[PDB]
Design a protein around this nucleic acid. Structure first.
Length: 295
RNA sequence: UUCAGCGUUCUUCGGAAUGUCGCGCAUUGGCA
């Protein structure tokens, strides 16, 4: 049951990539899954549905004009083609067939208006009272245009879909990304049946494109890599919880194929464990959502 | 010789702001 989940952001979001100063306009499926797990644990729900039947996608840019999917890594002005990152759903088939030209790719890049990124310079006055000093730091945020929003597609049974609806409503108050609970990431989310995507997903093409940041199991990896065009993205971070350890602990470093990576042989994903001797297992979504296309 | 005032100017010409600062310091950065 693939359900579109559109997110409208009221306040700017941080979405850090490596540092607090930087910012991204989207987040990986794992970052969303980790937020969904944290929420389910707060609301005292069973994690079996999320860990066994929920399939999600990286949040993708959406505009009133169009919904943007990630640019497939398919061999085809090379600058114009490399600058392009997201292609509207209507132009995805044209891009796959090679019917797109460099000027058309430039127009597609200009078409997206997800938002306007910025850097907010904050200060910490915690040490001023102890003969210390104010400490400047920078938070990179991204402000969506009013029509613009981030959407994700969630697939699963009816039970996990309803659980997702509950977690999503709680999540909007919780927020997403970094510096949430410090002014950022408040969003309001709608869950609906989308005719566009379900029709798009009902295609049996010769190539498979990874909607979500995903990694195959070892046995899956050996068949999948042959003839694959892909971009290994390091997935790293600290553990966010009150019960994992007394102090803040980094997760084990993970590498996942990025969204838009094209694999000839489809691989199902796996919820990996990036924990290192903690009081609970830190789950890292790496399951795979596939858009089959014809090239 | 008496009887009366009547007309014309109602303000004018200059000067209309000027000079001086136009953010500084601390954290940060930089050097070590």
């Amino acid at each position: 049951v693939v359900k579109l989940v559109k997110l409208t952001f009221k306040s700017p979001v941080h979405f850090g990539m490596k540092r607090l100063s930087d910012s991204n306009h989207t987040i990986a499926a794992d970052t969303l899954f980790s937020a969904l797990i944290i929420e389910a644990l707060q609301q005292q729900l069973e994690l079996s549905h999320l860990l066994n039947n929920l399939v999600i996608t990286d949040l993708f840019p959406y505009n009133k004009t169009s919904y943007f999917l990630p640019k497939p890594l398919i061999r085809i002005g090379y600058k114009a083609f490399k600058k392009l990152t997201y292609i509207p759903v209507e132009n995805y088939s044209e891009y796959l067939r090679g019917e797109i030209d460099s000027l058309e790719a430039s127009k597609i890049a200009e078409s997206l208006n997800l938002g306007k990124a910025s850097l907010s310079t904050k200060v910490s006055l915690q040490a001023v009272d102890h003969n210390g000093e104010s400490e400047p730091y920078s938070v990179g945020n991204f402000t969506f245009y009013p029509e613009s929003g981030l959407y994700f597609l969630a697939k699963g049974n009816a039970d996990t879909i309803g659980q997702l609806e509950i977690l999503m409503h709680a999540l909007q108050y919780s927020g997403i990304g970094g510096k949430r609970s410090a002014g950022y990431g408040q969003f309001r989310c709608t869950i609906e049946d989308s005719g566009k995507f379900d029709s798009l997903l009902s295609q049996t093409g010769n190539i498979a494109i990874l909607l979500s940041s995903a990694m195959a199991s070892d046995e899956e990896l050996v068949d999948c890599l042959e003839d694959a065009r892909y971009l290994l993205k390091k997935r790293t971070g600290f553990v966010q919880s009150k019960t994992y350890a007394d102090q803040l602990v980094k997760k084990k470093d993970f590498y996942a194929f990025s969204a838009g990576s094209t694999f000839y042989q489809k691989f199902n994903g796996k919820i990996f464990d990036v924990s290192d001797n903690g009081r609970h297992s830190v789950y890292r979504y790496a399951k795979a959502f596939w858009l089959e296309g014809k090239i």
